[PDB]
Ligand binder design. Structure first.
Ligand SMILES: [Cl-]
Ligand SMILES: [Cl-]
Lengths: 5, 119
């Protein structure tokens, strides 16, 4: 995944 | 018949109390609603079965859970989705670990209280 924060 | 819907209702009450404890433990509401695809556009390209507590409340009101195991599958789906998408350095990954710890502390007694409805 790319990431949230 | 009456006896069967009564059983299903009393079992749902046990599953609901457990989901409410999981929602309460999730103070930041990380898992309450589906992950927002407008904030995380690649989320669903990685997560093939998104799950969240509000979806579980809808399955409950529709009496979709017919065994404790079907409920547990969804709790552990939320947790393992969080481990799959997020890097282990993030607050998300730590919160999943924390709710997995909380869930594992509760499920034995709740699972027994569920089987005891149809004892
Ligand atoms: Cl929290
Ligand atoms: Cl973070």
């Amino acid at each position: 995944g790319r990431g949230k924060g | 018949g009456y006896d069967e819907i009564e059983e299903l209702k009393s079992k749902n009450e046990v599953l609901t109390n457990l989901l409410n404890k999981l929602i309460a433990f999730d103070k930041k509401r990380i898992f309450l609603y589906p992950v927002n695809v407008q904030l995380v556009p690649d989320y669903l390209n990685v997560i093939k079965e998104p799950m969240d507590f509000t979806t579980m409340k809808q399955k409950l009101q529709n009496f979709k859970y017919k065994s404790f195991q079907e409920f547990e599958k969804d709790v552990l789906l939320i947790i393992n989705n969080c481990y799959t998408y997020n890097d282990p350095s993030t607050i998300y990954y730590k919160f999943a670990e924390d709710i997995e710890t909380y869930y594992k502390k509760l499920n034995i007694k709740i699972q027994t209280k569920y089987m005891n409805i149809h004892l």
